[PDB]
Amino acid sequence: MSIKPGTYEVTSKVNGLHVGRPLAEDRSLLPKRIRVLPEDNNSGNSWVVEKDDDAYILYCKGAPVAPQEGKLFADLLGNMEDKKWIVTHQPQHGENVFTVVNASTEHGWVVPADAEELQQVEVRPLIAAPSYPPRYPATELFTFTQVESD
């Protein structure tokens, strides 16, 4: 698996849309949904990927992301558990394509095939064709494209 630590733009293979947080959110410290974004509402969504021992912590607009009740959020308060992710290259699906699977829950990022703009990214057990290598549905695949920073 693994991925080089650094700063990345992330898109869903389902629709090519960026994943992250939109321009406008409440001023609360409530966990913020990570979403499929419209093309006109996706700036400031270069994720930071940091190695964390054997896994990765993934920051969107400076907050680490974590699963809760089967959905993906940015943790603004800091009390969310399960912040480590296994990020694995799936070269059979393209050069910069990855699955993202929680290191503790074993559930991975999923964008449903019929996701709408602004819909929240899910976190579910991943499924794959029993082929060699396994072939993942696009709903579980993400393109991580290294940027510079900001």
User: What Å resolution does this PDB entry report?
Assistant: 1.8
Residue 95 CB contacts under 8 Å (≥ 6 apart), including other chains:
none
Q: Strand, coil or helix: what is 92? A: helix
CA distance 100 to 56: 10
Handedness of CA 7, 27, 42, 67 (dihedral sign): positive
Cβ partners under 8 Å of residue 3, min gap 6: 49, 56, 87, 89, 98, 144
Residue 6: closest CA among 87, 106, 110: 87
By CB atoms closer than 10 A (0-12, 13-18, 19+), residue 56 is buried
CB 99 within 8 A of CB 133: no
In this structure, CATH architecture of domain 1-150: Trefoil (2.80)
Cβ(141)–Cβ(17) below 8 Å? no
CA angle 116, 104, 59 (to 5 degrees): 55
Mind giving me the DSSP string for 39-72? Answer: TTS-TT-EEEEEEETTEEEEEETTEEEEEETTEE
For the chain, the domains span 1-150
